Design a protein around this ligand. Structure first.
Ligand SMILES: CC(C)Oc1ccc(-c2ccnc(NC(P(=O)(O)O)P(=O)(O)O)c2)cc1
Ligand SMILES: CC(C)Oc1ccc(-c2ccnc(NC(P(=O)(O)O)P(=O)(O)O)c2)cc1
Ligand SMILES: [Mg+2]
Ligand SMILES: [Mg+2]
Ligand SMILES: [Mg+2]
Ligand SMILES: [Mg+2]
Ligand SMILES: [Mg+2]
Ligand SMILES: [Mg+2]
Lengths: 346, 346
């Protein structure tokens, strides 16, 4: 409801974002062709998702800043900072799809698979990252939370890249890594790779924008939000295989890519010696036949039912965490986000 | 001489850099394996160059800060900031070698060509970038120039990535781009892709560290330094083909990659209609035979002699710029850098 309410305005602001980031073509003609490519990169990769991470910024901001302090310029800054989180996401996904050998994303071919793009997408991705800091400078430089936002985005990217490193190291191509696929390992990966940037970052940015900069307040928000991020990644892992691809807009690659997915960790905890062997012989390989055999094993082990039970226990746990740690922030900040991620099939 | 003098100390400080960036393994064991990979990435990609960009920071700092203000902590910060420029370089080269399909760098196989690395190097490269901002926080956060250094590194990366975009767009694989290879275009590419980060950034960082933050002073330094950066790129383009690879430590790919190199711009300005055709039929293609034919054309046109003449006229021009714009900074700041780049064969 609160997201549905704010969405249209958020998405509409994308035009101004594009306009301001391409406005340097005015004073420096010689970079015109690069700025044109930047616009095509933004249009292809920053649009077409759910905008949940960027919208969380705007939602939280409206709920945290006194309505009398929500003037036109203030709101424009909030939408800009929400867009910064979306640009960070677009940076990450462009590179990650290369790294994971993905085919589609958000209902279309991955940018790097477009003819004439290929590994040039590495540079495109990094330009998306650079745009975040240009927009923070253009819109927030004079604000008392400016440095806080800069350090928050830089720290989030570092933590996410630390997570991505654990993800890749635990998933080598061409090698059997079953021994490494543990619950403990899984939780560490997802905490770093997903939970910081997708959950703590947008809420913390709005906190800083509302002048809520206390260490204890940030640590209490973080306790709820990192646990929500872990659930979100487990659902992402479940959807990689069992999701509907016309809902998800992306084809799954976890089994082929030898990933430490929640599914494979659950499978391992439950496999007989013989099913372990089936997993061993079939996991982390490109053959469609071997990917099919893994999926058939998961289904044989009722993994979808185990996920649906996990979704329920996790929801309760997160709601207990909100009862404990939300104060003095409005619980609505966290509940609107929980509503948006739970029983979700995209 | 001044670089030779400062080098050993600079290189020795790399250990502390490594130590401090791996010190998070202490309090958070779960990221141990990522931190180990980060160390291997730093050791492979941040070592083995000339360290000129990082050393320029330390050299300029010593020449710009009153010797009475050069205490142990102050110097450690200068060496750390010099290392930040080297980490930025290592970030760029790792990604660029992927993008350019390079084979070797700094006398060894490119990191992404190592078995078991491949496109995981995209993430490695970005972690190198993240390390810059961790080191600025750990060492300079309490300093009045902290924000200035952050914005300078972020702005330099943006400008460099804008340059890289022009470079890629002007060099499409599989297509003839002769018409685009102009002097005007060339100068724009190199100004953005090379000159900002390799010349303006290290001197400007030391300026900010010395409390020299004036707009006019920065703009006067920049006039000298961007012209030096353009010469440096033209020499890099000449060395891609005519350099000795046991000096340069890298194999050239410009002709195969269809690059808007200074060599091809010079060739075009001088080619007969028939030599234009030779260039047209042979440029931007993987065949060793076609690369050989391009080189034979350049040699037929005395391009090495044209470069040696350009090196001399450019040196004079740069020295005229130093006579005009160095004040009130010591001309030694700029001359030590010119000495280090001119008549250079690495
Ligand atoms: C610099 C760049 C390489 O760093 C990163 C790029 C992407 C990511 C990242 C984090 C969390 N989720 C994703 N994508 C998901 P998705 O591919 O959308 O299902 P995952 O591959 O982990 O299953 C990517 C993290 C870091
Ligand atoms: C994010 C990343 C893709 O951005 C960049 C990566 C690398 C570079 C860059 C800039 C200047 N020189 C280089 N390398 C040289 P080199 O390969 O060392 O001869 P060039 O390919 O231009 O001839 C790379 C610029 C931007
Ligand atoms: Mg991935
Ligand atoms: Mg992926
Ligand atoms: Mg996934
Ligand atoms: Mg290049
Ligand atoms: Mg290159
Ligand atoms: Mg080169």
């Amino acid at each position: 409801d609160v997201y549905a309410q704010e969405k249209q305005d958020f998405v509409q602001h994308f035009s101004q974002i594009v306009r301001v980031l391409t406005e340097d073509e005015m004073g420096h003609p010689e970079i015109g062709d690069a700025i044109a490519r930047l616009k095509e990169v933004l249009e292809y990769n920053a649009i077409g998702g759910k905008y949940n991470r960027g919208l969380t910024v705007v939602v939280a901001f409206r709920e945290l800043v006194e309505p009398r302090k929500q003037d036109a310029d203030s709101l424009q800054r909030a939408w800009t900072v929400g867009w910064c989180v979306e640009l960070l996401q677009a940076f990450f996904l462009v590179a990650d799809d290369i790294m994971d050998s993905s085919l589609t994303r958000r209902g279309q071919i991955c940018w790097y698979q477009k003819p004439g793009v290929g590994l040039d997408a590495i540079n495109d991705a990094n330009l998306l990252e650079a745009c975040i800091y240009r927009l923070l400078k253009l819109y927030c430089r004079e604000q008392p939370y400016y440095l806080n936002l800069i350090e928050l985005f830089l720290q989030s990217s570092y933590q996410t890249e630390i997570g991505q490193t654990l993800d890749l190291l635990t998933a080598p191509q061409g090698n059997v890594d079953l021994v490494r696929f543990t619950e403990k390992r899984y939780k560490s990966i997802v905490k770093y790779k997903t939970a910081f940037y997708s959950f703590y970052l947008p809420i913390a940015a709005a906190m800083y924008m509302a002048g809520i900069d206390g260490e204890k307040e940030h640590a209490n928000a973080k306790k709820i939000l990192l646990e929500m991020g872990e659930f979100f990644q487990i659902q992402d892992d479940y959807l990689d295989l069992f999701g509907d691809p016309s809902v998800t807009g992306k084809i799954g690659t976890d089994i082929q890519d030898n990933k430490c997915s929640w599914l494979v960790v659950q499978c391992l905890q439950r496999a007989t010696p013989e099913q372990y062997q089936i997993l061993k012989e079939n996991y982390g390989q490109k053959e469609a036949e071997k990917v099919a055999r893994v999926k058939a094993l998961y289904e044989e082990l009722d993994l979808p039912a185990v996920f649906l039970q996990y979704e329920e226990d996790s929801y309760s746990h997160i709601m207990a965490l909100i009862e404990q740690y939300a104060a003095p922030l409005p619980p609505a900040v966290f509940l609107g986000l929980a509503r948006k991620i739970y029983k979700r099939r995209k």
